[model samples]
Target: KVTTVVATPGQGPDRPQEVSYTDTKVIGNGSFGVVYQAKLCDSGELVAIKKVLQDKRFKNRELQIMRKLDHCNIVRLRYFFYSSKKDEVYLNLVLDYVPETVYRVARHYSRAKQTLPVIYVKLYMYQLFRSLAYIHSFGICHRDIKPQNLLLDPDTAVLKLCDFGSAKQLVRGEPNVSYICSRYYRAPELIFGATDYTSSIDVWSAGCVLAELLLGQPIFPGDSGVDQLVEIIKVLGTPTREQIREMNPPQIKAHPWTKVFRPRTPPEAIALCSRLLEYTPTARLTPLEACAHSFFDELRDPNVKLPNGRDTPALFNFTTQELSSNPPLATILIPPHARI
Candidate 1:
């Protein structure tokens, strides 16, 4: 089927153009709206069309955040356009089609009674940190960080941070909803009802993702908001008075993460998790710092390859602006071989 519409580029000045696509079919959906897969008629490339109902009073926050986001680790937004279905108008976001997700990949291994290869855990998490660093540099907080939201290219092993529906450019002195983020990966501050939170929440969520990847199950699999805290305390113990004030936050003996995983799990990975899962948000490593951690040092090597013998994705291709936040880390981030 041939479908044509006027579409605007995700980034830069508005220069709406005529766009066409075919073979439309549903891919996924949620309370937000429906997502469809289709083939772009002009380019013959597959695209995911996320169709969400727009509020007339305010701009779509997802569209706004995605508009300026351009990174190899992020799902690229190619074009967007609006359509009216009677009383309400729907915004259609045409995004690059990624075939699989980290959730599915991890589940595949877990179902077979295995953990993801440590190298894959490193590669994917490093890319997540890289994308987080880029977004946090602009003060944008991806309130939602989960395996399902992380896209992956099956053959290339490229991971792209997708789904900005819960994202917001957080500014100091402004209050935000504490009810954001997925339940399994929600930061303690969010559960503590801290309206004035920081981007460290994303780091905390990333920690949960890493732990899940290693353990073959969710680290904090809570049934509800309150239960979530209890599960965390089961492993982290109770929180201190000072920590509560900090979290706005643990169990009464903390289980050692070393004991939490199988004996052969990498210590560097555990160390990275410990740093990221701090009760105090400020104590957690910043995204760039996480990227530079020894746990991810393997990703910096140029010789890394996927389990299927494919070359690793372009992980070191950072633009100058992406590295401007931490110059010292840039030297460490780009390996001698990948440099220039």
Candidate 2:
């Protein structure tokens, strides 16, 4: 059946237009709801329609956040519309269709007994941090930051951060559920029962993703909440009283970086991971700061090319709004050669 509705564009003018799509099929599903892949009739473009049960009493938070977000590394919300069936209301988000996810791509390498190339890891993580910097600057915390939520374009090696269902615009002193985020990627502060967490939790999750990409497996794989901490402790060692308080929350005498990662892993990569995986939420590096780290310096080089022979995606094209938060970093963020 063809679905048509008058929908407003995700951003800009209030004028709404009649949009039509067809050939829909389920692409994914989870506790939130089911996502369907459909073809837009007018443009002949593919889109992912995420359908979630909506409560009539309040506006959907995901919709509110998605509407406010506009970034190249973030998934684009084309349009959204509501539907009802059997007295149940559903909010559907129409998003740009990306053919692959970080999860599937990583798994493919694991299945083949090969680690994802270091260059690809650098490219993906750099973009992920860029997406984080943009959203974190807006006080948005992507509660869920696992690999599956990161959409990827295989041919171009472009990554778009997706899945805002668990995201929120975190306000200071406002209590949030600490039970949020996936177990393996959950921050130590969350596990310690801190309700007033900040967007830094997302940083912790991104750190886990980085480590996983480097190791070809989840860094902290645990069966349950308590077990998750045990996994972290096994690698990072037990937390001290001061460290616990900082958390509700590391250095390196015992477990050297060489032993932790493959001997060939670059020191810069390990250094970035160490800074990001800090137990103290406030001590963790901000997304923008992480972007400026030397580990990503390769991305700044104009001559670098992807392993597939394609030119690297635009990384230094920062908007004024993105640089406004920390103007000093602008010098390093955009290199001399990148400035036009």
Candidate 3:
């Protein structure tokens, strides 16, 4: 049966946009938050329905952010509606249905017995960094940016960054409510904010994603805070509170970054990670810098199309919010041919 949801478009004029959709299958196994893949009964377009049991926790935080964010690399939020369940009220958000995700894509290649192609790895990471560059400029931090939240388009190589459930803009002297969440890709400097918060935390998490794709697995993916920190300590210097009593940690140096990656791993490849994973927040390159980094230089070329001979995702379309610089960075980011 086609059920018409009295929903409101995530954007456009403030009005009701009734969406008649066939309530489809459950996309998640979670008990608290469940998602559905719905088909618009009238238009035949597919959309995802994310249902969350809600309250005063953060009404429309994600909704407002979704409405504000309109970018190619970020997922589009179409409509959002509220409905009731017998005794409990629930919130439903309708978003684009990007079935292929980075998580499964990586596993797909890994199952075929090799890490994701370095070329693709660069494309994906570049888009992600560009995505961050866009949001950070607006002072928004997508607190959670692990692989699972990244969506992918099959052919044109479009990677849509979704899941704004944990995204928020830091207004000023405000610390993260930490009551939110995170299991991996947590920046060491996170504190977890206000006192020491900035967009660089996202840069750090983006770096972890880079390293994970490069390493063919997760950077940490540990159980809890201490456990993941323990996983991270394996890479950086020894975690000594001077020495590690109730805890333990360690490191090794003089080793070429290549040693950690496959023998065929390129130098600039490893070089990029070293710059991103820096413990000092400022030391980490800004998302724009990450895009301009040598590792992705090839992407700036017009000839660099996907294997299907299709043009790469619209990589150089800088919104007004971006060169929103007007120069210097603008020149470096938008190539000559791409300039309008």
Candidate 4:
């Protein structure tokens, strides 16, 4: 079982020795935490604060990595605080809050066109790929890469990657890791029971993001683990038993799940998906490669420039007035410098 504590105003322990929160607005919520718009009193600057459940796995690791991340495409960590009284971690992060309106914009385009134009999808896809490439370059894999996590700055449509909760940093030349991402965006090798996987896991999720852009809806609609695997096979065919057996153990033997959902010919969607969702990480199109694909070429004409003469990108703005006046009660246990 998991335990969570919500910090009440002035009811928790004394504020952290060096951190403070002011004017907070609730933005997003999940089973484990609540995300709020806040300001760092020290800098009088805006940031996003994730109040994490004390018992959540890897809170320390997540905090350590987030604190050191310095990338244009990744979210920024301004400060963090923990409270023993509330048993919660107040993670103060700097972000350009992209209004949730952009998804509505994407949806509107889908409704008006009957089907979203391939070019528009490809154009935006290049930006997403570029962002992914940047993340992978740091030896980090954003295990959870999805549209919801991709924030668009309202000022520009510049796509920035968010939600590093499930991300993993692999050591150069080290063995691959396993069981790190959501089922819908999981790769074929993973579905076939591969115990060890690499950044290719992220690549597969990116591919799903691209497909959703084109279809203007979730590309995979699996209800369970078996159904998720079935959805993948229905579009991309089943892997042989040998493939499954070759992977790390706790394997589900070759069976009807393989043959039942196999597709005879690769659909148009497969062509696009093949760019990132491959069995082998090396075989998959790296984000850099996808950005250069011809698919994105046709969409180049509609590109717009910002007032600053730079390419127009999306932005999310969280002013200093949105945070709540809750003092911290505990301290984070993670060491700094663990993330690059």
Candidate 5:
């Protein structure tokens, strides 16, 4: 059966047009709802339609957030429409179809008993930070920052942050639920039950992702919430008195960077991780600052290419708004070769 509807594009003008899709099949599902893989009849393009049960009592923030976002590194929401099933109403988000995820990519390398290549790690992390920087600048916190949410294009090695189901635009002086984010990637402050947390929690999760890519396994593999902190303490050691104050105002020290990671891990990579995984939320490096870190310096070189012998994705193309957030680092963030 072919289904057609008049749907508005995810961004820009609110003009609605007819869209027809067929060959729909279930691709994914969760507590939120089901996602279907379908082909658009007009453009012959593949898309993922995320269908979630909508409550009449409230608006869907995920749809609202996805509409506001316009970033190359973030997943594109093509169209969204509401559907009815019995007494239930469903919100279906039509999104760009990215076939792979960082989770799958990492698992493949792990099964082969090999760490993901260092260059790919740098490329992926840099883009992730870029996406983070973009969203953080808008006060949006991707509450769930795990490998499974990072969509990847295997051939181009392009990564797009997806699944805004847990995202929120945090405002100062406002209290939020600290029980969000995946357990393994949850920040220490969250485990300590802090409601005034900031976007830095996402930075902590990104650090975990980097560490996992380097170690070929989760940097903090905890069975539960309490165990998650235990896992962090095992590698980062215990938190200090001031750290505790920073937490609940909260929440680690100089473990030798090289010793913590595999012998092959670079010094710059370890240095960036150290800055991001801090117990004090404010002490963690901002996404933009992380991008300016020396770890990604190799990406600034014109000659550096992906391991697949392909030109790297556009890493240095910064928009004015992106650079305005950290004016001091603008010159360093954009390399001479990348400047127009």
Candidate 6:
């Protein structure tokens, strides 16, 4: 993994002026921001704080995306504030405090060759699909969807999708938009330079996440853009002229490296990943479609009708100990008021 430098968030006078940090602890760090476990003074309830860097160029863009989103599966933003002394803006997120568990506590479990169980993967993907469905419905695409940004509340076993700084909204009737998904989880059309991509980019990432959970390793574990493409070709084979032409412009050509591998059909590609991974962004299974796939046939689908004929959310059994131990505090739950 590239070690990206963590920058202090920049604050402007227009930013919230009364921001204060109390009982904050470093939970996790990434190139984009540092997540902290903390509580809001007014509520005295625990929440997560994401300290996003203040690049004047992109600060407003991030703020706009965060403010417009509101869904059960996506992380809820309580408020936005800033620190004058540090010139940092703090994203006040209201979330269920989840204890650290298998993803965090069981660091050695993989060494023990204990793969991330299928049951757990099922639960994770179900929640993720639900979030993706909601985002897509809003005509927004989370450009960067990765495991590191996904949070699981141990107490409720509720998956809360986080990190919207890089998300993009597709205005209705907009002609074309630039590609923004992360290179690792990036869609093939993106690699092929499709100028007009849609929410399918997110579906591709969700597929990769599902595979990662199953294999206990990255599905498209690529060090570079070219390397990631190689992994995709190896598993799904290379895209054919027709396929590339459909997603990309006919004038655009595949890289010379693409010639080395063969291509897989839609069904074959689906077998490599859950239906969620379908390469055709337009045909890629929506979250609801993913929940209904046979892969999740045995397990309960959050999008389906329950035995009682009522919609029952897919609830996983997360022990109290598990919720308390999560390294990412925003991913956990507090008592009384549930994070969800």
- Between which residue pairs do clashes occur in model 5? 243-251, 244-250, 245-250, 246-249, 246-250, 247-250
Mark the regions of model 1 whose C-alpha exceeds 4 Å error after superposition.
85-87, 249-251
lDDT (Cα, tens digit) per residue for candidate 4, span 9-97 = 22223343445657778887874378888665556666676766555455555655565455555665544555445554444334445
How do the residues 232-312 of candidate 5 rate in per-residue lDDT, one tens digit apiece?
887787888899889885135545567988786788898999999998999999999999999999898889988889999
What value of lDDT does candidate 6 attain over all alpha carbons? Answer: 0.59
Report the lDDT tens digits of candidate 3 across residue range 100-140: 98988988877887788788888999999889988988888
Report the lDDT tens digits of candidate 2 across residue range 1-340: 8989877788777687899999999978887799999999999999999999998998889999999989989999999887885788888889999999999999999989889988899999999999999998889999999999999999899999999999999989789999999999999999888998999999999999999999999999988878788878878877777878887533323355557888789889999999999888888999999999999998888889988888999898898777766889999999898666
Lowest lDDT 10-mer window, candidate 4?
Answer: 322-331
Residue 76, model 4: Cα distance from true site in angstroms: 2.1
Candidate 5 global lDDT: 0.90
Alpha carbon lDDT of each predicted model? 0.90, 0.90, 0.78, 0.56, 0.90, 0.59
Local lDDT at 48 for model 4: 74
Query: On a 0 to 1 TM-score scale, where does candidate 6 land against the true structure?
Result: 0.68
Candidate 6, residues 52-148: lDDT per residue as tens digits?
6564445556566666666566677665654324555444333444554334623445678766545556656767866776677667788778876
lDDT at 191 for candidate 2?
Answer: 88
TM-score of 3: 0.88
Model 1 lDDT per residue over 1-340, tens place:
6999999999768999999999999978787799999999988999999999897888888888898899999999999999984689899999999989999999999999998889888889999998999898889999999999999987887899998888999989999999999899999999889999998999999999999999999999988979889888888888888988988833368898799989989999999999999889999999988888999877766677788998888887887767767878878888898655
Q: In model 2, which regions exceed 4 Å deviation?
A: 85-87, 249-254
